[PDB]
Design a binder for this molecule. Structure first.
Ligand SMILES: CSC[C@H](NC(=O)CC[C@H](N)C(=O)O)C(=O)NCC(=O)O
Ligand SMILES: CSC[C@H](NC(=O)CC[C@H](N)C(=O)O)C(=O)NCC(=O)O
Lengths: 217, 217
């Protein structure tokens, strides 16, 4: 079985976990636990960090026998290639590359906020900009079932994580955007995703690490 | 001709500029200028930000006729595909995806620091970590001329920007790492790269925007 190493949270493994489940991948999780405050003791990871034979040791990581992979997008692409869940044409590849990076910027905006000591002061401005961020995603998806079009690919798994987690942050945020709401349902309704989400494994919380101001538990 | 839009700085356009020059691409630059302090007035960009027909308006952008591309990695991949400067095999693609995301983490570390108000206090800790960062890049490159092996690809262009800019931040940083120094020379010695670097277009500073503590000019 493949090994997926990450913190015992949602974080950056969510899309990877879902993709692994969707693709019916044989895998098990190496789950590291961060200590509490004031420590935020990381030693579980730190001890074996340099022992896994990763070129750029990091969480998350994927071990698939010969292949040892860090960087969450690289893991996602790796698995997506293995199961034909990639953009094929130029137009699709362009769309894929734009989305992967754009979603990453959006992911990180929410993380920057929720780790910021000034969370309470900063929250409103983020919610001001929130509709415009969703609007661009909505326009882009249009009437298509999936972000690259007819066929589901890896970005849809990124898409879901970042869009859904906004909906856990601000529950009403997708209300203006019916196609994004339908996207969420489509995704969660997928036979394997649905089965997973009802299983003991599913790990939708905590969103962030114990160091977070919001979503630490 | 393609249009490359960005601020009148090095920033995230460097690798793109160099790739466009290397590939002998027909291109011209739409250069936006940020105001000074206290304003940092952005209105040059802001006015026509929503008028270029980009799905996710952003700097940098590439307009290639039908194709309008934002996100710097997306732009790089776009041009790389057009000129066969991509990882072909699985092992290459894995390496490419790892490196693109890793370098981007590294890039952002320097940017976080150089935009931080506590730049002076924070600088030493970054320089503490700096050798280990370089070491992992060095090990990964090994004896190969380019990061993916025999043939140069797009990551090399990212590689150059982030590694070189560290050498502008701390000039001695590559001294313990001869293969990285040779990488820099190999890259700078490429016929078209060399010609470009000696031309009037070449824009190696400022490193960051006027809002930066380090490398604003
Ligand atoms: C909050 S996510 C946990 C964090 N990992 C990253 O930041 C990886 C980000 C990377 N860009 C990726 O996408 O994999 C981490 O603990 N990394 C290992 C480390 O710092 O030693
Ligand atoms: C300091 S670079 C300038 C900054 N752009 C980005 O942060 C884009 C980053 C994106 N991840 C990319 O790589 O293109 C910017 O001015 N963006 C347009 C805007 O904010 O309106």
């Amino acid at each position: 079985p493949m090994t997926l190493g990450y913190w015992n949270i949602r974080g950056l493994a969510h899309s990877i976990r879902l993709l692994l489940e969707y693709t019916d991948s044989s895998y098990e999780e190496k789950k590291y636990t961060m200590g509490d405050a004031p420590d935020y003791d990381r030693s579980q990871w730190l001890n074996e960090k340099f022992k896994l034979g990763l070129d750029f040791p990091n969480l998350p990581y994927l071990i698939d026998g010969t292949h040892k992979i860090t960087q969450s997008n690289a893991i996602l692409r790796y698995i997506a290639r293995k199961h034909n869940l990639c953009g094929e044409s130029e137009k699709e590849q362009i769309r894929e590359d734009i989305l992967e990076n754009q979603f990453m910027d959006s992911r990180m905006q929410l993380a920057k906020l929720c780790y910021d000591p000034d969370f309470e002061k900063l929250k409103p401005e983020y919610l001001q900009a929130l509709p415009e961020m969703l609007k661009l995603y909505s326009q882009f998806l249009g009437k298509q079932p999936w972000f690259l079009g007819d066929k589901i690919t890896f970005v849809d798994f990124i898409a879901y994580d970042v869009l859904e987690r906004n909906q856990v942050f601000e529950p009403s945020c997708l209300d203006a955007f019916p196609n994004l709401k339908d996207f969420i349902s489509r995704f969660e309704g997928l036979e394997k995703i649905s089965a997973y989400m009802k299983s003991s494994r599913f790990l939708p919380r905590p969103v962030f690490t114990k160091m977070a101001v919001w979503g630490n538990k």
